[PDB]
Amino acid sequence: IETVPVKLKPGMDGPKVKQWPLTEEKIKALVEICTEMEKEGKISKIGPENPYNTPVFAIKKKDSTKWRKLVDFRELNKRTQDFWEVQLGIPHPAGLKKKKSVTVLDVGDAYFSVPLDEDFRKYTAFTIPSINNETPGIRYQYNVLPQGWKGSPAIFQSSMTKILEPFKKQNPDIVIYQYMDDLYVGSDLEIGQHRTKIEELRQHLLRWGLEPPFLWMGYELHPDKWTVQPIVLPEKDSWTVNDIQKLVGKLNWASQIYPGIKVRQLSKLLRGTKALTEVIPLTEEAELELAENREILKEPVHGVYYDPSKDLIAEIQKQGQGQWTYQIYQEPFKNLKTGKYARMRGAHTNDVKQLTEAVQKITTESIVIWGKTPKFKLPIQKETWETWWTEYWQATWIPEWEFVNTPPLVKLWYQ
Amino acid sequence: MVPISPIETVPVKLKPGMDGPKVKQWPLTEEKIKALVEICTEMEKEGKISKIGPENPYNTPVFAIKKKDSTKWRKLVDFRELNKRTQDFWEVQLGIPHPAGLKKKKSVTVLDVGDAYFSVPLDEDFRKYTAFTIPSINNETPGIRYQYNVLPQGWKGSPAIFQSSMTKILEPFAAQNPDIVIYQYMDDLYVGSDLEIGQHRTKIEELRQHLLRWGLTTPDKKHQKEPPFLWMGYELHPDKWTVQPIVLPEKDSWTVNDIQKLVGKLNWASQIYPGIKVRQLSKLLRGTKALTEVIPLTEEAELELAENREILKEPVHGVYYDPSKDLIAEIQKQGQGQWTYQIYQEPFKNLKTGKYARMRGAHTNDVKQLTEAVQKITTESIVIWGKTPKFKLPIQKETWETWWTEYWQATWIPEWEFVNTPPLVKLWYQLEKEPIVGAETFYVDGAANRETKLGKAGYVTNKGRQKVVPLTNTTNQKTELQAIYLALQDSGLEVNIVTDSQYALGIIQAQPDKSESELVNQIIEQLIKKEKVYLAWVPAHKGIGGNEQVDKLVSA
Ligand SMILES: Cc1cc(/C=C/C#N)cc(C)c1Nc1ccnc(Nc2ccc(C#N)cc2)n1
Ligand SMILES: NCCc1c(F)cccc1Cl
Ligand SMILES: [Mg+2]
């Protein structure tokens, strides 16, 4: 009820980001939403003395039919001061990624009960555009903590920990983690028990609240079952020339990750100009080298460590037939997580929808494990991505991304 | 008197750390000085400005212009310095409506709101920064000092503050009269509707009554301007639109500047005139920018210019948008990286047209260009109409499926249908996913000494076929492409090719059908003639025979 003083970083003005084009249905939905928010005092109309802007659009949360307003606060978040005044930070709970079930709740509506510092409100300006720019865009700013702003969970952190205090000590084995508008609550019990303690949680914010439009939904994870991928080599009875070339190529690549990998006995097998489909018998020396490489690849990569002061980088490869591989790392060849998706749902004919869902699930895994979002290297042309990703987005955060325009040779090795 | 509502004032600040202007007043002739004194006395009576005392330390130049072919002077305040120090504002003029997104209107009335502009109050705390001084006769007295109480012409904030003030005033009228549209531009309000001419004029009278609630008068003698309207380079009519006349000059020699102006006119015309082309004329502007240099027109630019003249022979108009109907976008390939499109709702009645040009880049193909054109039309359509059009594309559904399922990137184009209007976009080659049984295997390699620029390229096959070619003025990358070319040239209709060139596979995996490299183009020409090609990559200098034998042949 009284405002925390907030400021931008030194020598840094507010965001001035262009509003991107919105469809008729989106603009309409936002006009209806913002009219309600203005009546509730959450936002106010602003004048032309406010030159700042942050893009807004509208989405559908997973498994619902009601529009949710989503503000792209990525630039404001970069420019906003870092929040270490009461706490250097919330030391990320390493136990969250070890629970059997983690449910994600959209608690962002609770943020609207705390006023935003009157001097900082101007930096939250946004515009509802009109079709064909036929009428002036409707300009608002926030009067309360906005959803999607990195300062909202920080300013609300003191109020949230008191809200949850009765639930915490009645259920001491439960991990509860807050990232932006999401609450992650992990448990090891039966899913039926799990779902019931989730709804017990919901009551605590129901009670304190007196209505939250998206508090009742739950996206359930199982980080205990999360799969990884070690490097594996084929097991064959007959090797063609082409088979051995692909093996040597894959081992050459793997030797950047594992020092002890050797390929010289195997490369000697290719000595000769034989047809690509001709079977080559392995020499004893080549089979021993192959066996020793297999053993090396069963071991973890040497010198892999997470540094919270460095960015996480996520790379994605399209493997065809709806399957996608990805790696998360900070230094090249020191992967912190790798994986593969194929279950991308409601998109067997839409490459970009599949990629958008992959980005969202990789970001979710990143938040659970390290408490921050990776920067993505996307195998897509910038113009294709920017035209369509907002049509399939259903998370309340947005990571940063860049675009890969040269085809990687490494795609063959992660397949 | 009738009380009038004050217009709420916008708080204005200077840029952080900056102070107001302190610029010297230029000396003026006895002639201009008395002219300013009379104008400023009049303005002071109307409340626009106020005389100030001597302690205000700020000053902005005032001038008197001789309105040409008249004995009447008039007053201009040079606000350049204050504008540099004034804060930024939100400008809602950035995006202008496109005519093709407008709706048909039976009537459009114009109202003059010019005398409402100098009635918008200026923030009291900012007025001190607008101070100016009329020089005295013979500089024998202090100059007469004034400051503004209203938005001054030429000040940075006046357009945005005036627009926002008018919008706020107009909002309740527009909201409670949804059967009209209101658009403000310069000192005029444009009001359009589909209502019977009597109801329409009743709405206009009601708008005048609404505006008088703030003391804003409108001339009762109707505004000169009536449809059609000349606006932002367009002609707006009640039921159709076009661009203003596009006249391409006859010139026997062409300047850099002339060709720039020619391309600009063609670009403007291309939004309603179908099929406009600018590639060959744009090629003449490459790299140079001495605006007076004369460029001989290639024969290819002369033909494209002649083609454009014919397209521009007679007027073409677009229709307005019907929100109750789908949008259809149809695209044609024109050659040399050029694409043209039409957007319509009923056949033969275009809302607008446009074009797309191949992006700068070493290698390309038709499918990628068509994909980019689709995304450009999609984005423009969201801006203008708020929805994606349905597409009619010169590419077979089977061609598209083969492309996107196998392309290394994610790619997508929205709801579309094949239209069989040549030239069709097709896939010119597709590489095998597995080695070909019974096809000869070519192990290729090339290398060059980077000092000598001397190189070799060649191959060795499973059947003992061999070739090495000596090369001059070449590079490692060029010799690696040459080796693949030789293998394609000397093989039968099915071929397996083994290379260690990461560079060559990077290019080939991008599936080009056209290149700025003649060597890549020659490779493409060879690929098109094959039945089956399998391309295999191996790492270099590992002892992989075939590649180890010919590496030794080419690096010698
Ligand atoms: C953008 C705009 C420019 C002018 C005019 C600018 C000037 N000068 C006049 C109006 C009223 C508008 N606003 C809108 C909004 C929606 N449909 C239309 N349709 C429409 C406008 C003019 C004519 C005509 N003749 C026909 C249809 N206009
Ligand atoms: N069927 C005529 C409308 C239409 C469509 F429904 C889907 C794709 C293209 C086009 Cl033009
Ligand atoms: Mg070599």
PDB file of N, CA and C and ligand atoms in Angstrom, chain B residues 328 344 390-392 415-417, ligand 2:
ATOM      1  N   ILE B 328      -8.266 -11.600 -50.308  1.00  0.00           N
ATOM      2  CA  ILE B 328      -7.520 -12.553 -51.163  1.00  0.00           C
ATOM      3  C   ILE B 328      -6.256 -11.856 -51.666  1.00  0.00           C
ATOM      4  N   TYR B 344      -7.575  -8.285 -53.210  1.00  0.00           N
ATOM      5  CA  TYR B 344      -8.942  -7.980 -53.600  1.00  0.00           C
ATOM      6  C   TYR B 344      -9.915  -8.760 -52.725  1.00  0.00           C
ATOM      7  N   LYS B 390      -6.187 -14.577 -47.554  1.00  0.00           N
ATOM      8  CA  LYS B 390      -6.031 -15.976 -47.989  1.00  0.00           C
ATOM      9  C   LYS B 390      -5.151 -15.834 -49.225  1.00  0.00           C
ATOM     10  N   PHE B 391      -4.194 -16.737 -49.412  1.00  0.00           N
ATOM     11  CA  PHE B 391      -3.253 -16.584 -50.540  1.00  0.00           C
ATOM     12  C   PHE B 391      -3.508 -17.462 -51.762  1.00  0.00           C
ATOM     13  N   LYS B 392      -3.270 -16.906 -52.938  1.00  0.00           N
ATOM     14  CA  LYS B 392      -3.305 -17.659 -54.204  1.00  0.00           C
ATOM     15  C   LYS B 392      -1.853 -17.614 -54.689  1.00  0.00           C
ATOM     16  N   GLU B 415      -2.817 -20.094 -44.637  1.00  0.00           N
ATOM     17  CA  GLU B 415      -3.824 -20.677 -45.558  1.00  0.00           C
ATOM     18  C   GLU B 415      -3.674 -20.180 -46.986  1.00  0.00           C
ATOM     19  N   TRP B 416      -3.455 -21.125 -47.885  1.00  0.00           N
ATOM     20  CA  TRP B 416      -3.212 -20.753 -49.288  1.00  0.00           C
ATOM     21  C   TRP B 416      -3.748 -21.798 -50.263  1.00  0.00           C
ATOM     22  N   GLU B 417      -3.879 -21.393 -51.515  1.00  0.00           N
ATOM     23  CA  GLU B 417      -4.315 -22.310 -52.584  1.00  0.00           C
ATOM     24  C   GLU B 417      -3.444 -22.117 -53.828  1.00  0.00           C
TER      25      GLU B 417
HETATM   26  N1  LIG C   2     -11.378 -20.619 -51.986  1.00  0.00           N
HETATM   27  C1  LIG C   2     -11.262 -19.250 -52.349  1.00  0.00           C
HETATM   28  C2  LIG C   2     -10.751 -18.547 -51.124  1.00  0.00           C
HETATM   29  C3  LIG C   2      -9.431 -19.129 -50.669  1.00  0.00           C
HETATM   30  C4  LIG C   2      -9.326 -20.006 -49.604  1.00  0.00           C
HETATM   31  F1  LIG C   2     -10.455 -20.327 -48.940  1.00  0.00           F
HETATM   32  C5  LIG C   2      -8.146 -20.574 -49.195  1.00  0.00           C
HETATM   33  C6  LIG C   2      -6.991 -20.248 -49.873  1.00  0.00           C
HETATM   34  C7  LIG C   2      -7.049 -19.416 -50.972  1.00  0.00           C
HETATM   35  C8  LIG C   2      -8.247 -18.854 -51.329  1.00  0.00           C
HETATM   36 CL1  LIG C   2      -8.238 -17.743 -52.650  1.00  0.00          CL
END
